[PDB]
Amino acid sequence: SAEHVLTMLNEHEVKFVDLRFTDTKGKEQHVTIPAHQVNAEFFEEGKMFDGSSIGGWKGINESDMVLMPDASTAVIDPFFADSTLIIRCDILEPGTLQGYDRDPRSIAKRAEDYLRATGIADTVLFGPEPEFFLFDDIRFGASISGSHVAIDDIEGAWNSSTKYEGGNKGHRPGVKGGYFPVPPVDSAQDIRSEMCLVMEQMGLVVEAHHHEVATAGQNEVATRFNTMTKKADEIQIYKYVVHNVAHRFGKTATFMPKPMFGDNGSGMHCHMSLAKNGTNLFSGDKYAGLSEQALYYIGGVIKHAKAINALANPTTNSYKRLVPGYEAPVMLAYSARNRSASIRIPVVASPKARRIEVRFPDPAANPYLCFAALLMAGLDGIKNKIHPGEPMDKNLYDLPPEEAKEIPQVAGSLEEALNALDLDREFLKAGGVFTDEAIDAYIALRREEDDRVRMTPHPVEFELYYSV
Amino acid sequence: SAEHVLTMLNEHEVKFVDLRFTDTKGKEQHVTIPAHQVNAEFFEEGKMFDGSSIGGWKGINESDMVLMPDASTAVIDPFFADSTLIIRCDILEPGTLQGYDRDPRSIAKRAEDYLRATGIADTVLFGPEPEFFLFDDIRFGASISGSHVAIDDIEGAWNSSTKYEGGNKGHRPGVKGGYFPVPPVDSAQDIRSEMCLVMEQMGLVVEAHHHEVATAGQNEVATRFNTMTKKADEIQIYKYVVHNVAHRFGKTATFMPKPMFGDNGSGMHCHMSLAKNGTNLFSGDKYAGLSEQALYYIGGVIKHAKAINALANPTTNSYKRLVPGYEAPVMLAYSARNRSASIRIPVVASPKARRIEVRFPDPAANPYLCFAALLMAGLDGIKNKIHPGEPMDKNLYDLPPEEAKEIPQVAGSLEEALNALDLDREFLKAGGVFTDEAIDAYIALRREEDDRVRMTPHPVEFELYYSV
Amino acid sequence: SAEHVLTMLNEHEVKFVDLRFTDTKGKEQHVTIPAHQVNAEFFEEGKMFDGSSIGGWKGINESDMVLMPDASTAVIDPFFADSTLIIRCDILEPGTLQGYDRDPRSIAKRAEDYLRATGIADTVLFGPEPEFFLFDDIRFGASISGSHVAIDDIEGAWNSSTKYEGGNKGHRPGVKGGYFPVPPVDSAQDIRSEMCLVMEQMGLVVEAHHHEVATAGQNEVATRFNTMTKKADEIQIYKYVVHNVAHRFGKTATFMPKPMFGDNGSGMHCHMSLAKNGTNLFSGDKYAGLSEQALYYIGGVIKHAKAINALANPTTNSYKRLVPGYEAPVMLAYSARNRSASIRIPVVASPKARRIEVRFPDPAANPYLCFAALLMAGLDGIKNKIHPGEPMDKNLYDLPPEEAKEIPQVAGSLEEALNALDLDREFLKAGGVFTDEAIDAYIALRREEDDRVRMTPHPVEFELYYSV
Ligand SMILES: Nc1ncnc2c1ncn2[C@@H]1O[C@H](COP(=O)(O)OP(=O)(O)O)[C@@H](O)[C@H]1O
Ligand SMILES: Nc1ncnc2c1ncn2[C@@H]1O[C@H](COP(=O)(O)OP(=O)(O)O)[C@@H](O)[C@H]1O
Ligand SMILES: Nc1ncnc2c1ncn2[C@@H]1O[C@H](COP(=O)(O)OP(=O)(O)O)[C@@H](O)[C@H]1O
Ligand SMILES: [Mn+2]
Ligand SMILES: [Mn+2]
Ligand SMILES: [Mn+2]
Ligand SMILES: [Mn+2]
Ligand SMILES: [Mn+2]
Ligand SMILES: [Mn+2]
Ligand SMILES: [Tl+]
Ligand SMILES: [Tl+]
Ligand SMILES: [Tl+]
Ligand SMILES: [Tl+]
Ligand SMILES: [Tl+]
Ligand SMILES: [Tl+]
Ligand SMILES: [Tl+]
C-alpha cells in the first residue's frame, strides 16, 4: 500500500513508476511517471488523462477519467533498463471517484462485492490454465490484392526438410506430438523456467511447466489459483512475462486460440470454487463429492454459456478451436471423466480441494470480464436453484446422432456469442455489476472485428471456389 | 550566472563551451569555443560573428552581430565526447547591445517585459505538450524526374508482412492503435525513459512519458510548465535530447506535424495562464472556474488565430494535420469537453491550476515566436475586453451544416496564415515587440518554402491525373 | 447519319459498334454492342444502361438513362482487332429524351443553341492547341508509409549518364531544349506522323506536328479548328489516338499539365472567334484588327476567368503550370505581343482569320465544359458590353511591383477556382445551359480530388521539415 510503496522506491532506487491498467478487449496498457511524481496526493486522488484516446471508452464530450493506483499491486519490472515500479490502477470517474462502468477491473471488483452482498460466499477462487505458442517468425497481412499468414519455428514439423545454415539438427515434435518428449525435441526448457522464475519474482506462484501438444512451440506454465480479481491481475502479469521473456530470447509468443489448422489450439480452462469462513462451499454428498451449491453453479454456467462465450471466447479465431473435435470441449454438460464435457469435475482426495473446471475459455479472453461473467452466471444458478440435470459420463457426439444428440452446446461463432450476450444480459446486470452501455460498448467493439473477418476473402475460398 | 559558470568549468573539467541560439525558423544553432576563451570580458560584451551567413538575418552591408551569453542557461552537454558546457545566447546589435529585432529569443523576452509593463500580470506560464515520431529509416528526394518519401520503422503496421533476418517477431501497434499497449508492442520504453533522465539532467522536469496514438513510433514526453521564455528554451533542449537520444539508439526522430496520411499527426498543445504576486489570474467565478480575464485572453486568441497559425503551424505540412478530422482541433471555440474545440478548458480541482489549452500548435513552430504570438494575442484580448462569445459544448462540424456551421476556423493553408499575419500584424507590434521588418522577413522565408511545395508535382497528382 | 451508318457496316464488314461518351471529369467512356444489334429502333430511341454505376451522375433512386447515338460521328476504330465502328452518343433522360443536365456533351450543345438564340452569332469556332508528353516508364504510388513518382524516357536529359544494354547513344534534348532539334535528338518523328495519319483517318485535319520545349518527350500535333461541340469531340478523338498510338509504339502518353518541376508544362491554348452568315464577327477597326464585339468577349473572359479556371484547369496539377513564370500566362490582360498576357491576339493578315487566343487552359480540362464556359463568359461580356480595359503591351510582373502590379490574375489553386465557380455561377446558368446541380456535382467531384492532394504528405515536405 501507500506506506509500503514509498519504501520500495528507496529500497530499489526506483527511477520510474509504470501505471498499468486493462482496456475493454483485455490488453494491458501503461503510462510512465518519474518516481519523484509519487506523493501523498497521488495515492488518495490519483493522476488523470486525455483519455478520449482509448477504445470503447470514447465519449466525444466527457473524455476525462482518473487513474487510481492500487498500492497493493506494486512490483518491480524485470525487463526495463532503468529501475521502475509497476502499479496497477483502477479507472474512476472524476469527482465521484466511483469506478468507471466500462473499467474491466472495476467490474470484476463489483462482482466480488456482489458475491459477499448476497451472502452466498465471501471469496471466489479462480485457477486458469492459459496455454500459448512460441514462434521464431510470424508474418501476415491483408490488402486489396490478397492476404496471408506464415508461421515459423525451429520446432515446426514442417522444418524437418529445411536447410539451416549450420545444418538441420532434426529433433522436433511431430504434429500433435510435442507432448513431453525430453530435450532436444523440447527446445523450450530453459525458456519456460526463466518465465517461471520471473513470474514468481512478480508475485505469482508456479505449480508446473511443460511443453504442450502442438508442434511449433505450444507451451504452458501452470500457476496457483487466487481470488478472482487478483487472479485476473496475475493473468495480465503472466501474459506480460511470457511475451517479454519470449522476446528477450529471440522468440515471439502468442495467446491466440488457434494459430494453426490441424494441431492443438490454446485454451484457458478455468478451475473455480466458492468459500465462506475458510470452508469450501463446493464439497458435499452429491455427485463426485460436489455440494448441491456447486451443481446450481454449474447449472448457471450451462444456462448462460453462449453469453459467457462472448467474453471467454471473444475472437472469431476462438471458434476455430471450439470445433467439433472429440477432445474439443463444446458440449454443455458436466462429468468427472468424459472429455467431450465442457465442465470437468476434478476427481480429488481432499474435500478442501473440490471444484469445477470450465474448459471452453481461451487466453484471448479479458480475464476480468471472462471471470466475472463465469461467476455471475454461477450465482444466477444458485440464486435460482438451476439444476444442471444429469452428468454426461457416457461418451461424446462422436457417438453421433443417438437422438441426434441434442445436448446444449457452446456458441458456434462470435456473432452468435455476441447475440446471446445481447439477449441473455440480465444475469450480468445483477448487482449493477455490468451496465447496459458497458455491455453494448463491448458488443460493438467485437462486432467490428467480426466484420473484418466476415468481409475479407479467405485464402481457402480460392482453393474451393476460384474455378467455379 | 557568470560567477557560477566559472565554477562549473572546474567542477567538470570542461574543455569546450558550446554557444547556442535559435534562428528565425526555430532551429537551434551553435558554435564552439575552447573553455580557455571564457573570461570576465566575454560575459559583459560577448563574442561576435561573420553572421551575414545566417537566413532571414542576412543584410548585405551590416552583417555583424553580437553573441551574448546568458549565464543562467549553463548546462553540460550529455552527448559530446569531450566535456563541454552549453550556454544559450541572445543576439544583440553591436555597440547598442540592445537586442536584434529578428532574434526570436529577444522577441520572447520583449513580450515578457511588455506583460509586466501593462501591469496585466507579472509572469506568463507555458506548458507545451510536444509530440514526436521515432523511425528506423527515412528516405526522400525530389529531382526533375520525380519525388519520393519512404518511412520505415520496426513498429510500422506495414511490417507485419516483412521478412527480417532473425525472424519477424510480430508485436506491433496497428494504425491508430499504439496507444498504451505494454511492451513488446510498445518498443520504446527504454528509449523514452533515457530521454527523461537526460532531459532532467539538463534542467527540465518530467511529468510523464508514453507511446502515442500513431503506429510506427509516435511518442511523447510530458515536461512541467515554466515561464514563457524559459519554456521555449526548454523546448529547444527537449528537441535536442529527443533527436540525440534517438540517434544514439539507432533511430531518427522527427517533429514534423504530419509524416503519414491515415494516422495521427504530432501536435503541441499549449497550456497557458497568467499570474500576479503568486495569484492565478485565470481562476474566477465564470465558465468552468475561469476568471473574466481568462475569457478575454481566449477572445484575443480566437480573433488573431489565423495570424498565430503562421507561427504555431509554420509549415505546409502543419495543414495536413489541421484537416477536417473529428478530433482535429480546427474550430475557433472554447469548451471543457468538446474535442472539436481548439481551446480545451482543463476541468480541474484547485483554482491554483486553472488555465486554457490552445490545441492547434504543432512542434514545427518556433517556440519563441509561437509562444510570444499566443501571449500578445491574449493581451490584446484583455486590453480590449474581447468577449470570446459562448462556449461550444455541443458537438463538432461532423455535426455537419446546421447553419452551415459557420464557426470561425484556423487557417486552411500556410499561404493563408501568412496572409493573416501580414494584415493582422498590429497586435504583435504592440510594445515594439515585433517589428515590421522582423515580420516581413519571417513571411518571406516561409513564403519560399510554401513555393517549393506549391510548385513541385505531387505523387498523388499522378494517381489522380496521369490518365487525364 | 442513320442511313449512312448502315452503309459503313457493310462497306467495312463491321463486327462491332463502340458506343462512346464523356463523363463529368472529361474521360471518354465506352460500351460495345455487336453490329447486328444496330437497327431502325436503335437510332430513334437509343439503347439504355445500369448507369447508377458512373461518377457525378450517381443518384441512388433514379439510376437509368438513355444512350443516343449521333449518326454523324460514325468512324472506324483503327486499333481494335475486329472491325468496329465508333459512334459518339448523347446521354438523354428516359421518356423525355431531353438531354441530361450533367451530360457534358448536351451542355456544350445547349451553349451552341443559346448562341444562336441570342442572335449574337450563328457559329462558335474553337481551335485548341493541346500538348502532351511521351514517356517510356511511369511509376507512382501512395500508402501510409510514403509516396512516390518516377518518370523515365529515352529523351530524359537525366539519362545522359544511364547505362543501356546496347550502349547509351547520347543524343537527347536538354532541359527546356527539345525544341526543334532534328532527329536523333528528336526521337519522335515517326511517332508523331503516325498520330497525324490516324487522326486524319478519324476525321481530324492536321495542320502541323513538332516536338515541344520540355525534355523527356513533350510533343504536339496541331489540328484545324472547328465548331465548338464538334471540336470537343475531336479533342476526345485526339487524346484517343495519342494515347493508343503511343501505346502501340511501347510508350505511354499523358496530358497532365505539369509532370515535371523545372521544365515546361503542357497547355491547351484556345483560339476562338464568332461568326454570322460567313462573316467573322471579330474583325473590326479597334485594337489589332479586332471588332468591339471581340473586346466585350475578352472582357467577359477576364471577368469570369477564375470560374472558367475550375473547368479549363480542373486539376491541382494545373496550378503547378500556372505559376509565376515569365512565360506562364497568368495575367488577366490582352496583348498582341506580351507573353505574360493570358490572352494573345494573333497578329494576322486576313480579316477572315481574326480571333483571340486564351492561353491558360490545359489538356486535363473537359473539352466540352471548358469550351462552353469560355463561350458563356464571352457572351456575358457581349450582352453586358464589358470593356476589357486597355491592352497590356508593356511587360510582365517580372517587371515586379510598379504599383505592386495589381493586375487581375487566374486562380492560384483549384480550391480557389472551385470557389469562384461556386459564386460566379450565373453566367453559366444563362439559357439554362448549366444547372445548379450540374455545377454543384462537378464542384464536389473535384473537391474530393483536391482533398487527396491537400491531405497527403508531400515528399518535399520531408526535405523541408523532417529535421524541424
Ligand atoms: N479451490 C481450489 N482448490 C484447489 N486448487 C484450485 C481451486 N480452485 C482452483 N484451483 C487451480 O487448478 C489449477 C491447475 O491445473 P493443472 O491441471 O496443473 O494445469 P495443466 O494440466 O493444464 O497444465 C491450478 O491453477 C490450481 O491451483
Ligand atoms: N498554470 C498552470 N498550472 C498548472 N499546470 C500548468 C499551468 N500552465 C501550464 N501547465 C502544464 O500542462 C502540461 C501537461 O499536460 P499533459 O496532459 O500531461 O500532456 P499529454 O496528455 O499530451 O501527454 C504540463 O506541461 C503542465 O505542467
Ligand atoms: N477563326 C479562326 N480562323 C482561323 N484559324 C482559327 C480560328 N479560330 C481558331 N483557329 C485555330 O488556331 C490553331 C493553331 O495554332 P498553332 O499556332 O499552329 O499551334 P502551336 O504553335 O501551339 O503548335 C489552329 O487549330 C487554327 O486552325
Ligand atoms: Mn494444458
Ligand atoms: Mn485443465
Ligand atoms: Mn499527446
Ligand atoms: Mn493535451
Ligand atoms: Mn505549343
Ligand atoms: Mn499557341
Ligand atoms: Tl493522445
Ligand atoms: Tl494437454
Ligand atoms: Tl490445448
Ligand atoms: Tl561563414
Ligand atoms: Tl496527436
Ligand atoms: Tl512552344
Ligand atoms: Tl507549353
Alpha helices, H only, C249-291: none
Separation of alpha carbons C51 and C29, rounded Å: 12
Separation of alpha carbons B127 and B235, rounded Å: 10
CB contact C45 to B (< 8 Å): no
Complete DSSP assignment for B312-369: HS-STGGGGTSSS-SSS--EEEEESS-SSEEEE----S-GGG--EEE----TTS-HHH
Atom of ligand 2 nearest to the CA of B273: 1
CB contact B467 to C (< 8 Å): yes
CATH number of the structural domain spanning residue C54: 3.10.20.70
Report the DSSP pairing between strands C206-211 and C66-69. unpaired
Residues B378 and B436 reside in one and the same domain: yes
Ligand 13 centroid – CA A192 distance (Å): 62
Residues B16 and B163 reside in one and the same domain: no
Q: Which residue from B78, B102, B80 is spatially nearest to B90, judged by alpha carbons?
A: B102
Residues B310 and B194 reside in one and the same domain: yes
What are the backbone dihedrals phi and psi of residue B160, each rounded to the nearest 5 degrees, phi first? Answer: -60, -25
**Which grid coordinates belong to B62?**
551590416
Separation of alpha carbons C51 and C63, rounded Å: 6
User: Is A60 among the domain residues?
Assistant: yes
Contact assignment for C459 to B459 by CB distance below 8 Å: yes
DSSP state of C412: S
Report the DSSP pairing between strands A331-335 and A279-280. unpaired
CATH number of the structural domain spanning residue B178: 3.30.590.10
Ligand 4 ion: nearby residues, β-carbon < 5 Å: A 220
Cβ-based contacts of A82 with chain B (< 8 Å): 190, 193-194, 197
Pocket test for ligand 1, best of A205, A223, A271 (most atoms within 8 A of CB): A271
Residue where the block lists cell 530499489: A12
CB contact B398 to A (< 8 Å): no
Ligand 5 centroid – CA B450 distance (Å): 66
Separation of alpha carbons B235 and B219, rounded Å: 16
The answer to whether the CB of B5 falls within 8 A of the CB of B18 is: no
Residues B164 and B299 reside in one and the same domain: yes
User: Is C449 among the domain residues?
Assistant: yes
Q: Within chain C, what is the greatest distance between any pair of CA atoms?
A: 71
Separation of alpha carbons C301 and C295, rounded Å: 10
Q: Residue B323, Cβ neighbours under 10 Å: how many?
A: 15
Contact assignment for C468 to B26 by CB distance below 8 Å: yes
The answer to whether the CB of B238 falls within 8 A of the CB of B222 is: no
Separation of alpha carbons C164 and C157, rounded Å: 14
Q: Is the dihedral of CA A235, A237, A239, A242 positive or negative?
A: negative
Identify each DSSP E strand in A224-296 by its residue range: 226-227, 252-254, 268-276, 279-280
- C-beta of A142 in contact with ligand 1 (< 6 A): no
Full residue range of the structural domain in which residue C73 is found: 1-103
Residues A371 and A401 reside in one and the same domain: yes
Ligand 6 centroid – CA B220 distance (Å): 6
Peptide bond into A184 cis (omega under 30): yes
Separation of alpha carbons C43 and A356, rounded Å: 81
Ligand nearest to the CA of C259: 16
Separation of alpha carbons B117 and B98, rounded Å: 18
User: Is A381 among the domain residues?
Assistant: yes
Least CB–CB distance from B161: residue in A37, A82, A139? A139
Contact assignment for B262 to C144 by CB distance below 8 Å: yes
Beta-bridged to residue A254, according to DSSP, are A133
To the nearest whole Å, the CA of B275 is away from the closest chain C CA by 32
Residues B60 and B159 reside in one and the same domain: no
CB proximity list for A24: less than 8 A, separation 6 or greater: A55, A56, A57, A102, A104, A366, A369, A441, A442, A445
Q: Within chain A, what is the greatest distance between any pair of CA atoms?
A: 71
Separation of alpha carbons A58 and A102, rounded Å: 10
Angle between helices C367-383 and C228-248 (to 10 degrees): 150
Separation of alpha carbons B422 and B311, rounded Å: 12
Pocket test for ligand 2, best of B213, B271, B290, B345 (most atoms within 8 A of CB): B271
- C-beta of B207 in contact with ligand 2 (< 6 A): yes
Interface of B with A in 406-425 (CB under 8 A): none
Q: Residue A384, Cβ neighbours under 10 Å: how many?
A: 13
Q: Which residue from A357, A356, A355, A359 is spatially nearest to A331, judged by alpha carbons?
A: A359
Q: Which of A88, A103, A118 is the last residue of a domain?
A: A103
Q: Which of C103, C124, C144 is the last residue of a domain?
A: C103
Residues B111 and B259 reside in one and the same domain: yes
Q: Is B272 annotated as a binding residue?
A: yes
**Which grid coordinates belong to C203?**
476525321
Residues C371 and C422 reside in one and the same domain: yes
Residues A402 and A423 reside in one and the same domain: yes
Q: Is the dihedral of CA C181, C183, C187, C192 positive or negative?
A: positive
User: Is C463 among the domain residues?
Assistant: no
Alpha helices, H only, A249-316: 292-303, 305-312
B160 to each of A136, B175, B213, B215, C42, how far by Cα in Å?
Answer: 14, 12, 18, 12, 56
Q: How far is CA C251 from the centre of its chain?
A: 21
The answer to whether the CB of B214 falls within 8 A of the CB of B264 is: yes
Cβ-based contacts of C175 with chain B (< 8 Å): 144
Q: Is the dihedral of CA A391, A395, A398, A402 positive or negative?
A: negative
Contact assignment for B170 to A138 by CB distance below 8 Å: yes
Q: Residue A231, Cβ neighbours under 10 Å: how many?
A: 24
User: Is C221 among the domain residues?
Assistant: yes
Peptide bond into C391 cis (omega under 30): no
User: Is C23 among the domain residues?
Assistant: yes
The answer to whether the CB of B57 falls within 8 A of the CB of B51 is: yes
- Count CA atoms within 13 Å of residue A343 on its CB side: 27
The residues of A annotated as belonging to the active site are: 50, 129, 131, 212, 220, 269, 339, 357, 359
DSSP state of B167: -
Q: Which of C103, C127, C160 is the last residue of a domain?
A: C103
Report the DSSP pairing between strands A356-358 and A268-276. antiparallel
Interface of B with C in 285-314 (CB under 8 A): none
Least CB–CB distance from B460: residue in C147, C151, C320? C147
Residues C166 and C47 reside in one and the same domain: no
Residue where the block lists cell 470514447: A58
DSSP state of A400: -
User: Is A463 among the domain residues?
Assistant: no
Taking the CA atoms of residue B370, residue B371, residue B375 and residue B376 in that order, the dihedral angle to the nearest 10 degrees is -40
Q: Is B265 annotated as a binding residue?
A: yes
Residue where the block lists cell 457581349: C382
Residue where the block lists cell 502518353: C253
DSSP state of A353: G
Cβ-based contacts of A94 with chain B (< 8 Å): 347
Separation of alpha carbons B270 and B358, rounded Å: 5
Q: Which of C101, C103, C131, C233 is catalytic?
A: C131
CB contact B183 to A (< 8 Å): yes
Residues C333 and C226 reside in one and the same domain: yes
Residue where the block lists cell 456544350: C108
Number of compact structural domains in chain B: 2
Separation of alpha carbons C338 and C329, rounded Å: 10
**Per-residue exposure over B170-194, b if at least 16 CB sit within 10 Å of its own CB, e if not:** bbbbebbbbbbbbbbbbbbbebbbb
Length of chain B: 468
Beta-bridged to residue A140, according to DSSP, are A149
Ligand 7 centroid – CA B269 distance (Å): 5
Q: Which residue from B405, B231, B411 is spatially nearest to B304, judged by alpha carbons?
A: B411
Residues B57 and B139 reside in one and the same domain: no
Pocket test for ligand 2, best of B122, B123, B129 (most atoms within 8 A of CB): B129
Beta-bridged to residue C226, according to DSSP, are C126
Identify residue A25 by its one-letter amino acid code.
K
- C-beta of B127 in contact with ligand 2 (< 6 A): yes
C44 to each of A190, C51, C67, C68, C105, how far by Cα in Å?
Answer: 85, 20, 11, 8, 18
User: Is B235 among the domain residues?
Assistant: yes
Contact assignment for B162 to A139 by CB distance below 8 Å: yes
Separation of alpha carbons B253 and C427, rounded Å: 53
Q: How far is CA C330 from the centre of its chain?
A: 17
Method: X-ray
